[PDB]
């Protein structure tokens, strides 16, 4: 808390980069983990209009 | 509908409930015909209950104009400069006494669609969620797949 | 020894019932980031829409303009909150 | 054809195993049912749409005291698939005219005759 | 989750009976009690006519048992007051 | 024509004031406007049942998002906040997760303590004394 | 009754040991006394409350506004003590009832600012090919509360 | 499916999940309890005879007396003369 208006808004809706190792993993259990993180469905600030998806990097 | 009509947020005028409650009507203005059946109830409102009303709230200054009109109007002016002109045409005395008490209770803000049913100005106390709450910190700030 | 959540990231949660058993008192002071868990501060329309799509990771479609109908339907004085 | 259904008397003769599963007494049985409709009268024949009006069960999930007599029970045997029957148990007695305005019917089926909203 | 509330004896809906929806929502700041809610006056009136129905239907059984307990005795002394002369 | 309609202009503007923000000729031509202004009003009242549906689906997706941050699933949080008689609804629980994440971390700690008290009561069948957070408060 | 270590022999969740209930109530007395001392000395700052007003639950802080969709038969300006507080929280502690906090502990005040009506809000019915078309415009009455203070008292 | 998926000779098959099996089973257990509580009446059929005939007969008499009291309402001179008030003026 105690932020200004503009850096508080930036911190909440910032996009985060997730790594996700795909070695010996099924591709559908990686797809469920990625498409939650790609939608923003892991954030409590989630809305379908707020455009709060993150970046998932699968190796 | 709501996509046709404007909208606003739930507010008050000058934080109307924090220190004291300021009555938000300034004026009521009645045009009431002396001869006319359309202002039959409006003549009985002035005769009976406008003197009981003008003592129940001494901040409202009431003007009864009494000119030959076909439609009697009531022109409620508020503290934020808004004007809500309504008609009391062919209304009984019990129907003007609630129409005027409705004009006293409300503020001068528009009766357009209110977006949220609440208004917090400090919505967060423990600090609003950002992605780095509920995420533990690694040693030395090392991101994944970083050796040094 | 027991902790219902791994009190490591957000705050140190301690749950407690009062002696009547009617209110639940939760005590949670904020955890601080340690000093050793930080880093020191280190000290044409076609090609331009391909350049911003690579820059902001959006598609090409949101950089093309819109007509006069959508441009003047927009509320340029929108209601503000908070 | 599709007719009304005569259910035999064998179905409504409770076994001594049944007195152990549900907490009823064969000798000294309960006096008042608590009837509650839990299925719709739509897609049901007209002889069940009218019995439900006779017992007052037009609203779903609204309880209704009915006597445990073999004439009320003949109407409950028609629409037993629509309703849920439980005994009205009375821990304290039936309410007097002083305790009439402080009653509450609980979800266990019991009618408490003193209902404060304070904990124990 | 209302199949747990039915085991504790509460209403399956938390909006049923209990302290949440039967206590007064507000009071005056000086401490005078509020006039009762229209949904509490309507519920207490609907609970009274339910309890009046428990009192009415239980007495109609108990008075109906005593009438059969007298008619089966009046049938009985009719059998014994003809067995003479 | 003894009495023909003199005020037909204002009956058209009763409909055409609702159509001003449409597309095509639905904003101008009255014959095309009433079949859409009526249809814009039926959708306005049929979407009072979908606002309450789409808000609760949003609250469930914002509680499920925040309970996963503490390792809880959504049915493991709602199901065990009821068992502690904490009758918070979905609107506040989705607005506790955004604006007060320390209090939401305490509700995820409480719903996981009651969950572990539910398993330990279930593996130890037979009469065992109840858990500490599993004791119900009775009202009479 | 021993099973060797395969993958399915043991359950996959970690075996959680629940702590002893005689030492937990002693630990619960330490946590309750810690938070109670924060109420006496004034360690808290801004409080928020979750109040079960009319039919729903409002997350409520001080100096805010609430819009309820019914007339409250009050005068504009009358201070109102909202009962049924069911969660009170600060930056460092929260108290949450079962299901309500006591009236001895919290006191949430509220004024009444305005008693408006809603915006004119249409109800239109239509069925195709049936000449079924109804229109109705309702304005539900509304009231606006301004929460003045969420006081807390050391009764724990 | 040849025509109209759910009617006719060849329909598309519908199958019973664990939802639909458990939904019928917990409705079958409300029903088995219903057969229990209807199996033990408080009175036999000869004891209940006429036990509420005095209340049933008085119930109909109050419907019958409400039916035979349908008549026009009273017409007052203070409803006819109050229409003179539409031209009530000031002076
Ligand atoms: Mg076909």
Curated annotation (Swiss-Prot), chain B:
Keywords: Mitochondrion, Ribonucleoprotein, Ribosomal protein, Transit peptide. GO terms for molecular function: RNA binding; structural constituent of ribosome. Coiled coil: none annotated. High relative levels in skeletal muscle and testis. Lower levels of expression in the heart, brain, placenta, lung, liver, kidney, pancreas, spleen, thymus, prostate, ovary, small intestine, colon and leukocytes. Expression is coregulated with TWNK. GO terms for biological process: mitochondrial translation; translation. Its main location: mitochondrion. It comes from the Eukaryota. It is found in: Mitochondrion. One of its GO terms (cellular component) is mitochondrial inner membrane. Component of the mitochondrial large ribosomal subunit (mt-LSU). Mature mammalian 55S mitochondrial ribosomes consist of a small (28S) and a large (39S) subunit. The 28S small subunit contains a 12S ribosomal RNA (12S mt-rRNA) and 30 different proteins. The 39S large subunit contains a 16S rRNA (16S mt-rRNA), a copy of mitochondrial valine transfer RNA (mt-tRNA(Val)), which plays an integral structural role, and 52 different proteins. Belongs to the mitochondrion-specific ribosomal protein mL43 family. This is Large ribosomal subunit protein mL43. It comes from Homo sapiens (Human). The lineage of its organism: Eukaryota, Metazoa, Chordata, Craniata, Vertebrata. The chain holds residues 2 to 149 of 215 of the full protein.
Swiss-Prot record, chain C:
Keywords: Mitochondrion, Ribonucleoprotein, Ribosomal protein, Transit peptide. Belongs to the mitochondrion-specific ribosomal protein mL42 family. Its main location: mitochondrion. Component of the mitochondrial large ribosomal subunit (mt-LSU). Mature mammalian 55S mitochondrial ribosomes consist of a small (28S) and a large (39S) subunit. The 28S small subunit contains a 12S ribosomal RNA (12S mt-rRNA) and 30 different proteins. The 39S large subunit contains a 16S rRNA (16S mt-rRNA), a copy of mitochondrial valine transfer RNA (mt-tRNA(Val)), which plays an integral structural role, and 52 different proteins. The keyword Mitochondrion applies. It comes from Homo sapiens. The keyword Transit peptide applies. This is Large ribosomal subunit protein mL42. Disulfide bonds: none annotated. The chain holds residues 35 to 142 of 142 of the full protein. It comes from the Eukaryota. One of its GO terms (molecular function) is structural constituent of ribosome. One of its GO terms (biological process) is mitochondrial translation. GO terms for cellular component: mitochondrial inner membrane; mitochondrial large ribosomal subunit; mitochondrial small ribosomal subunit; mitochondrion; plasma membrane. It is found in: Mitochondrion.
From Swiss-Prot, chain F:
InterPro entries: Ribosomal_bL20, Ribosomal_protein_bL20_C. It is found in: Mitochondrion. GO terms for cellular component: mitochondrial inner membrane; mitochondrial large ribosomal subunit; mitochondrial ribosome; mitochondrion. Its main location: mitochondrion. It comes from the Eukaryota. Component of the mitochondrial large ribosomal subunit (mt-LSU). Mature mammalian 55S mitochondrial ribosomes consist of a small (28S) and a large (39S) subunit. The 28S small subunit contains a 12S ribosomal RNA (12S mt-rRNA) and 30 different proteins. The 39S large subunit contains a 16S rRNA (16S mt-rRNA), a copy of mitochondrial valine transfer RNA (mt-tRNA(Val)), which plays an integral structural role, and 52 different proteins. Interacts with OXA1L. This is Large ribosomal subunit protein bL20m. It comes from Homo sapiens.
UniProtKB/Swiss-Prot annotation, chain G:
Its main location: mitochondrion. GO terms for molecular function: RNA binding; structural constituent of ribosome. GO terms for cellular component: mitochondrial inner membrane; mitochondrial large ribosomal subunit; mitochondrion. One of its GO terms (biological process) is mitochondrial translation. Keywords: Mitochondrion, Ribonucleoprotein, Ribosomal protein, Transit peptide. It is found in: Mitochondrion. Component of the mitochondrial large ribosomal subunit (mt-LSU). Mature mammalian 55S mitochondrial ribosomes consist of a small (28S) and a large (39S) subunit. The 28S small subunit contains a 12S ribosomal RNA (12S mt-rRNA) and 30 different proteins. The 39S large subunit contains a 16S rRNA (16S mt-rRNA), a copy of mitochondrial valine transfer RNA (mt-tRNA(Val)), which plays an integral structural role, and 52 different proteins. This is Large ribosomal subunit protein bL21m. It comes from Homo sapiens (Human). The lineage of its organism: Eukaryota, Metazoa, Chordata, Craniata, Vertebrata. The gene is MRPL21.
């Amino acid at each position: 808390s105690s932020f200004s208006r503009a850096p508080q808004q930036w911190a909440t809706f910032a996009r985060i980069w997730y790594l996700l190792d795909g070695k010996m993993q099924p591709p559908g259990k990686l797809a469920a983990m990625a498409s939650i993180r790609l939608q923003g469905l892991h954030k409590p600030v989630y809305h379908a209009l707020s455009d709060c998806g993150d970046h998932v990097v699968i190796m | 509908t709501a996509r046709g009509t404007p909208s606003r947020f739930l507010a008050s005028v000058l934080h109307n409930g924090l220190g004291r409650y300021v009555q938000q009507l300034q004026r009521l203005s009645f045009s009431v015909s002396r001869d006319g059946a359309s202002s039959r109830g409006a003549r009985e409102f002035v005769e009976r209950e406008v003197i009981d009303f003008a003592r129940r709230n001494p901040g409202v200054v009431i003007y009864v104009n009494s000119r030959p009109c076909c439609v009697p109007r009531v022109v409620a002016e508020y503290l934020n400069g808004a004007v809500r002109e309504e008609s009391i045409h062919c209304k009984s005395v019990e129907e003007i006494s609630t129409l005027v008490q409705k004009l006293a209770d409300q503020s001068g803000l528009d009766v357009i669609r209110i977006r949220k049913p609440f208004h917090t100005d400090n919505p967060s106390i423990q600090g609003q969620w950002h992605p780095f709450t509920n995420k533990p910190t690694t040693f030395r700030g090392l991101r994944p797949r970083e050796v040094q | 020894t027991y902790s219902p959540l791994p009190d490591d990231y957000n705050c140190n949660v301690e749950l407690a019932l009062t002696s009547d058993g009617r209110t639940i008192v939760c005590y949670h002071p904020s955890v601080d980031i340690p000093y050793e868990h930080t880093k020191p501060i280190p000290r044409e329309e076609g090609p331009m829409i391909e350049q911003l799509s690579k820059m902001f990771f959006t598609t090409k479609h949101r950089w093309y303009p819109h007509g006069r109908y959508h441009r003047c339907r927009k509320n340029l004085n929108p209601p503000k909150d908070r | 054809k599709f007719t009304r259904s005569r259910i035999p008397e064998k179905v409504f003769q409770a076994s001594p195993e049944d007195h152990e599963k549900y907490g009823g007494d064969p000798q000294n049985p309960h006096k008042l049912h608590i009837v509650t409709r839990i299925k719709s009268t739509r897609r049901r024949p007209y002889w069940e749409k009218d019995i439900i009006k006779m017992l007052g069960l037009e609203k779903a999930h609204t309880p209704q005291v009915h006597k445990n007599i073999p004439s009320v029970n003949a109407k409950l045997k028609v629409v037993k698939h629509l309703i849920r029957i439980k005994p009205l148990k009375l821990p304290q007695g039936l309410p007097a005219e002083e305790n009439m305005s402080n009653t509450c019917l609980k979800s266990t089926g019991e009618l408490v005759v003193q209902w404060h909203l304070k904990p124990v | 989750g209302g199949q747990w509330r039915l085991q504790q004896g509460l209403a399956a809906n938390p909006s049923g009976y209990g302290p949440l929806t039967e206590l007064p929502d507000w009071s005056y700041a000086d401490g005078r009690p509020a006039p009762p809610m229209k949904g509490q006056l309507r519920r207490k009136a609907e609970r009274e006519t339910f309890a009046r129905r428990v009192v009415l239907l239980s007495q109609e059984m108990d008075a109906g048992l005593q009438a059969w307990q007298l008619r089966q005795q009046k049938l009985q002394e009719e059998q014994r007051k003809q067995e003479n002369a | 024509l003894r009495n023909r309609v003199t005020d037909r202009y204002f009956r058209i503007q009763e409909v055409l004031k609702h159509a001003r923000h449409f597309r095509g000729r639905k904003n101008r031509c009255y014959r095309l406007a009433v079949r859409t202004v009526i249809r814009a009003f039926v959708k306005c009242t049929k979407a009072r049942y979908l606002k309450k549906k789409n808000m609760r689906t949003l609250w469930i997706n914002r509680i499920t998002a925040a309970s996963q941050e503490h390792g809880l699933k959504y049915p493991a949080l709602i199901g065990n906040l009821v068992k502690c008689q904490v009758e918070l609804n979905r609107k506040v629980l989705a607005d506790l997760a955004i604006y007060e994440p320390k209090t939401f971390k305490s509700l995820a700690a409480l719903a996981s303590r009651r969950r572990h008290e539910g398993f330990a009561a279930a593996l130890g069948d037979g009469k065992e004394p109840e858990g500490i957070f599993s004791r119900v408060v009775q009202y009479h | 009754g021993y099973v060797p270590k395969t993958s399915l022999s043991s359950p996959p969740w970690p075996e959680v040991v629940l702590p002893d209930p005689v030492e937990e109530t002693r630990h619960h007395a330490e946590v309750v006394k810690k938070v109670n001392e924060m109420i006496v000395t004034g360690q808290y700052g801004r409080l928020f409350a979750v109040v079960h007003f009319a039919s729903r639950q409002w997350k409520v802080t001080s100096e805010d506004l609430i819009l309820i969709g019914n007339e409250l038969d009050l005068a504009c300006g009358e201070r109102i003590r909202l009962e049924k507080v069911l969660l009170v929280g600060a930056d460092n502690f929260t108290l949450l009832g079962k299901p309500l906090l006591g009236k001895d502990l919290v006191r949430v005040e509220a004024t009444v600012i305005e008693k408006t009506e809603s915006w004119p809000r249409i109800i239109m019915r239509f069925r195709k090919r049936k000449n079924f078309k109804k229109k109705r415009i309702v304005t539900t009455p509304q009231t606006v509360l301004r929460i003045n203070s969420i006081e807390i008292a050391p009764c724990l | 499916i040849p025509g109209r998926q759910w009617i006719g000779k060849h329909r598309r098959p519908r199958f019973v999940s664990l939802r639909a099996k458990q939904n019928m089973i917990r409705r079958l257990e409300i029903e088995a309890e219903n057969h229990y509580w209807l199996s033990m009446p408080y009175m036999t059929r000869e004891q209940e005879r006429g036990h509420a005939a005095v209340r049933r007969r008085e119930a109909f008499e109050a419907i019958k007396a409400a039916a035979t009291s349908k008549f026009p309402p009273h017409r007052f001179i203070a409803d006819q003369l109050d229409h003179l008030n539409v031209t009530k003026k000031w002076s």
